[PDB]
Amino acid sequence: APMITCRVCQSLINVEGKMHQHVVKCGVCNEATPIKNAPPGKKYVRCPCNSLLIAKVTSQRIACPRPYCKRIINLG
């Protein structure tokens, strides 16, 4: 059983049959952790609320969609 470590809660995530995906969901904290580089023209952004977002490379600021969050994330 191939495993990667959750970036948020550090539980192990079983990635069997999921190695074609870019990100995988943790069964403990329910957040996502990447297993591949973001697609070209995109970039991963981790919100302080723990959400893994996918942004365009042309974005300096990212609004989180989480309803309890709605943080504006400044990337530079």
Partner: peptide, 10 residues
């Protein structure tokens, strides 16, 4: 240097 609505990777 733009602002975008974040999309969940999930």
């Amino acid at each position: 240097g733009y602002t975008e609505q974040g999309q969940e990777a999930l």
